[PDB]
Swiss-Prot record:
Domain PWWP: 7-64
Job of this protein: Acts as an epigenetic regulator of myogenesis in cooperation with DPF3a (isoform 2 of DPF3/BAF45C). Associates with the BAF complex via its interaction with DPF3a and HDGFL2-DPF3a activate myogenic genes by increasing chromatin accessibility through recruitment of SMARCA4/BRG1/BAF190A (ATPase subunit of the BAF complex) to myogenic gene promoters. Promotes the repair of DNA double-strand breaks (DSBs) through the homologous recombination pathway by facilitating the recruitment of the DNA endonuclease RBBP8 to the DSBs.
Subunit structure: Interacts with HDGF. Interacts with trimethylated 'Lys-36' of histone H3 (H3K36me3). Interacts with trimethylated 'Lys-79' of histone H3 (H3K79me3), but has higher affinity for H3K36me3. Interacts with IWS1. Interacts with H2AX, POGZ, RBBP8 and CBX1. Interacts with histones H3K9me3, H3K27me3 and H3K36me2. Interacts with DPF3a (isoform 2 of DPF3/BAF45C). Interacts with SMARCA4/BRG1/BAF190A, SMARCC1/BAF155 and SMARCD1/BAF60A in a DPF3a-dependent manner.
Family designation: Belongs to the HDGF family.
Protein name: Hepatoma-derived growth factor-related protein 2
Organism: Homo sapiens
Summary of the tissues where the protein is detected: Widely expressed. High expression is found in heart, skeletal muscle, ovary and testis. Overexpression is frequently observed in hepatocellular carcinoma samples.
Localization: Nucleus; Cytoplasm
Length: 93
């Protein structure tokens, strides 16, 4: 059975006007800006951008990859597909 989301989990994260995007739940470093209540820090692979999203926009990677894990024209997307599959827990700092 599913648990709640935790740092390190891999997802496709959905934002308005973008395709479902390879991403991970990030840790919050000591001294770093915390997300709002009920939101998670989402690190988007490829673009290496962070947004704060809630679970309704988070699709677990294993379940969703057959649907969403396909090349896309958008900038950083295919780079992001490589990262989530090949080194999803690396520092992209």
């Amino acid at each position: 059975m599913p648990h709640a989301f935790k740092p390190g989990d891999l997802v496709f994260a959905k934002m308005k006007g973008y395709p479902h995007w390879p991403a991970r739940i990030d840790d919050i470093a000591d001294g770093a800006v915390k997300p709002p209540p009920n939101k998670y820090p989402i690190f988007f692979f490829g673009t290496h951008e962070t947004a704060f999203l809630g679970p309704k926009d988070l699709f677990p990677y294993d379940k969703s990859k057959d649907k969403y894990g396909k090349p896309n024209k958008r900038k950083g997307f295919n780079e992001g597909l490589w990262e989530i599959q090949n080194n999803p827990h690396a520092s992209y700092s």
